[PDB]
Copies of this chain bind each other. A is one copy, B any other.
């Protein structure tokens, strides 16, 4: 779980910068997030170290699985959150 919490946080952080995502797009981002990085809800936080780790683990997932089944919004959201955390 933590889906509701994380989504509520994401949408706040993004709308603060004028970007808006569908509720269902944010949910699918999060479902994707915890698949690639299952430790994240349990052990991770919104901090640059963890978020860069999430990103390495995604760009590994892209090499080992191809663009197929990677949501089109995942990388752009990951990237926006990286900038917010910089």
Closest CB of chain B to A60's CB: distance in Å? 22
Count of interface residues, chain A, beta-carbon cutoff 8 Å: 18
18 more contacts with CB within 8 A, not counting A4-B43, A5-B5, A5-B40, are A1-B2, A1-B41, A1-B42, A1-B43, A2-B2, A2-B5, A2-B42, A4-B44, A4-B50, A5-B6, A5-B41, A5-B45, A5-B46, A8-B45, A8-B46, A8-B47, A9-B9, A9-B46
Closest CB of chain B to A42's CB: distance in Å? 4
| Contact indicator A2/B46 (Cβ below 8 Å) | no
A1-48, CB < 8 A from B = 1-2, 4-9, 12, 40-47
Chain B residue contacts of A2, Cβ below 8 A: 1-2, 5, 41-42
